[PDB]
Protein: 2-keto-3-deoxy-D-arabinonate dehydratase
Amino acid sequence: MKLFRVVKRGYYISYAILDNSTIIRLDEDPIKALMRYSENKEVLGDRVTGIDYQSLLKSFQINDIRITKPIDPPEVWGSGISYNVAKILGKTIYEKVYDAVRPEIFFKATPNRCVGHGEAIAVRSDSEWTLPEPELAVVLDSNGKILGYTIMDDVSARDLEAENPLYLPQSKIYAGCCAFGPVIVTSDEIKNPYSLDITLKIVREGRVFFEGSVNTNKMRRKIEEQIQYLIRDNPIPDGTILTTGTAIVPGRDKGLKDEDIVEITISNIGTLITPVKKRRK
Amino acid sequence: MKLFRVVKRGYYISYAILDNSTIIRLDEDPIKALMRYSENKEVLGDRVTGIDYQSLLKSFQINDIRITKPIDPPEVWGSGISYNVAKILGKTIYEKVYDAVRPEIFFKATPNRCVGHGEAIAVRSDSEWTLPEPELAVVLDSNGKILGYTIMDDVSARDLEAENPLYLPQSKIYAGCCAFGPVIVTSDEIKNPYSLDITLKIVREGRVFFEGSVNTNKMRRKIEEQIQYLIRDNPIPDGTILTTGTAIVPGRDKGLKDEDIVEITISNIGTLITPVKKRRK
Amino acid sequence: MKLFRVVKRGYYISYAILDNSTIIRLDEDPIKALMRYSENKEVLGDRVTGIDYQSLLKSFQINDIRITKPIDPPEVWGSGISYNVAKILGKTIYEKVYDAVRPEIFFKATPNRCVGHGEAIAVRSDSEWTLPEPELAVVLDSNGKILGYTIMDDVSARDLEAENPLYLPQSKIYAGCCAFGPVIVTSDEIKNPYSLDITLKIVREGRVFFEGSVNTNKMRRKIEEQIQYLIRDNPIPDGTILTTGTAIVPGRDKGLKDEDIVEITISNIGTLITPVKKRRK
Amino acid sequence: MKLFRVVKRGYYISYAILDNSTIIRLDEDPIKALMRYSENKEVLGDRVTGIDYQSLLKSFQINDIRITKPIDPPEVWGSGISYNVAKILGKTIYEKVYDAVRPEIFFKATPNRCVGHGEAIAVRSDSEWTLPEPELAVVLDSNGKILGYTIMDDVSARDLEAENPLYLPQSKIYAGCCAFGPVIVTSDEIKNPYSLDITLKIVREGRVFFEGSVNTNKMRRKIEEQIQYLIRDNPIPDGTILTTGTAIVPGRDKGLKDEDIVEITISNIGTLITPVKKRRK
Ligand SMILES: O=CCCC(=O)C(=O)O
Ligand SMILES: O=CCCC(=O)C(=O)O
Ligand SMILES: O=CCCC(=O)C(=O)O
Ligand SMILES: O=CCCC(=O)C(=O)O
Ligand SMILES: [Mg+2]
Ligand SMILES: [Mg+2]
Ligand SMILES: [Mg+2]
Ligand SMILES: [Mg+2]
Structure:
């Protein structure tokens, strides 16, 4: 099942698409729905027609409905390094985390700092080099069970971070610092999570300013281990998103700018598209 | 005005004490109440008797009422360094932040990871050296206006941090990682914020295991500046707590242990007391 | 448009059927929906398939959905005589009301005393002669504007009434004293309200125990006048039902009994069917 | 305990006075509170000072608080005759009810048609002779257990009724047709319900236009019996008011008029005062 959500005259309506192109309008809250599905694959709702999922993907709105975040995730958390700066004993903090038993885990966002397909991501007013970070993300219940997968953009102000790692939070958490969607796919829609293509394109005035790709079979730090360290002594709410870290990193000249289009593709999920918007002083 | 809150048969009731020892039961939500006060000092409620604030402070419960967090703060954020590790060009990341224009700001907690007076703080199952960090904290509205002050304990797993700064989040954010109270005092209850005594005591089986004190006149990074960087491109909800960083740091042999009592005193606020509880595997 | 409602695992879902047999799942509350329609005929929802209105009519349930009252009407009111007992000066109270400027208006039910298609109506434990009263009913807004029409059964303990008119309330108001449905049709679905056939059948063990019919062109007291006296100094909530009085009255030997089936048909609306259930002592 | 309620800036606050003049602010909903009390006399709340019950009684408002209905009763029901018109076989319908096994019971009001101490009762635009009916009233739970007592004014358009008993509903049910308060007293505050004085005064421009009194020891139809017929096959919600019928009836020249003051006194309860307001066309 593939879950999405629209905003229609101030209210949400959630839908699920089945493999056979049939759309179900959801009865339940979508987080609640995902949970039921991971139990017995049962789905409460009515089959609808006249809902053009394919058009929504391309055009974002259609009459009085607009696509958006598939769920409001109570908490978003990130993983780091799963594929002239700070060093401990001539070893770089990043390569140290790469070896150590303990993976990097950071707080990414609250739901109101996230955005969805066809909404704008943001570049901090004071960031000189902000990069999108294309990542596989998992939707979790409170026991760290995987309720499904989605594309996330861990938008990061890389310049503020390289300046000092103690700025990582400021570099990671702010309005529009995070985008995800356009769907959440259920666990069975992905036979093997370590075998999917992730592809970033940046588009400047029609111009392909950056392109790059990589496969999840090149992920060192396994997802279960990331989940284990996330939840250790740390209770998470149902519907939490964990973003598993990126493997595609543009150069220092590829910083984002106002009006750019960021497009991210993951196999079996779809393509997340977000305009970029530079904030002001 | 000094605001506190109790839990009585599954429900909250908020009270305010006025300088003249008269207790008002609150009509409004306490965050909403704080906002009104910072506008015109008006307070909606009834004068109550038979509510023993002084006993509550000492004994935590009394009949069917128990003191707790004075508010549920939608977000808690921390400030760092306002008074053999990682270094950028032979300069330590901490001393670099100390000089730079940009202060350290980190995400501390969500409301359900916080606790109050007479409730237990926690030591991560996998932390070998967790220290309490006694700090002045401010309650904010969405424009970063100061609605009031309180004592906070930024409980931190210092060993996980010194191991690698990329572990700072894991070291800072977990169930019981944060305590505050026992009251929130309104802005006028503190004539000069840079002139107050902060005092930490740790108590092990009746034994004063650690004691230390310092005055806020020794704070380098001013509060307004911390607030400014917090809110920059980063929208905060009403009732957010910013904890302004600690100046009292026990040695490496002073790690917390199960059943310890942590007591923190700040002038004009009161004394926050929390048992400690080591988590398991 | 023709509105109905089902109960599915403890929750309601409202649907509307359009003349062309297409079913819309409702976005809004159905009372709210009716109001919008009487303004501009606009309907907020999604076209559904797999909802078998025609089967629901016949079989009441289907999988996990069951038909019921089309709305919860905040108030139900009745009209009387619009087509050896009590007399004022040798004139019978009923024939007096028939002549007078002022029509009879009585309080009929609250929503929890009403029932719908395929649910049981009730006969008071202490009633010896209870008759169903088949009537055209109107759904009203607070200004007494007609939002639509439906079939109502003003179930009445005629024996308690004929004994004394001061017992009329006891005779009219009790659990299961009132049934309506199976749809509410919008005002435009009925070109002329004074030109419709009403037909009562009572069914005892398969046996047609009573049958009778009449046309609304034989209604003396016009609906607008009934509405006018209802709302005079008497504010009604949105979604109130006014039942306009009956013209079909079985004899004294036709009292209802446990397990009877009451079936009522009105042109363009449909057929309301309710088992009967005698209460106990 | 004696329960009352005020309206303060758009919100309710309920209070209870104990015999010893101490006022408790209520924790619970007041209907819920009454129920608890009838179980074990336990009361959840805080003792308040600065709430001038005695002034509220006299002056209705005080600063930003105003007295009103003590509860919102989901349903109000009335009893009749418990102490040239319509006749069955030369016997008057009223004297027939007086003898019969079955008492009169009628639907009186919904909560939004009721008003309280110091609010205006209404006279129907089209009523020529409306009388107040001073009555003892009981607050009920769903099993018809008596949760307490209060004064009610069954305001009745006697002229519309005497014209035809089928107009009784129109005569009884309309905006402002019903007033009650100023308190609800708990069952133990009244040792013997059949031993209390009820006193009506009507006041026209300072002038005592009517006065009269009677004692409940002159009530024929006992309360339990009224309750029994009320609840028979007729489920009532918690907090229902049953008004037990009046024994004080002014003459045909004593019809109410705009600006009158109606004052009703019942022993151990208090004095209900309501201005009168004639409605228009
Ligand atoms: O700088 C630490 C964050 C690393 C990260 O976000 C990633 O690898 O995706
Ligand atoms: O390690 C960074 C946090 C510093 C801090 O919390 C403080 O100074 O209070
Ligand atoms: O007895 C009065 C009620 C009359 C009535 O309900 C009707 O005519 O439908
Ligand atoms: O006319 C019937 C109502 C009688 C009544 O309300 C009373 O006796 O109080
Ligand atoms: Mg990342
Ligand atoms: Mg700190
Ligand atoms: Mg009828
Ligand atoms: Mg009466």
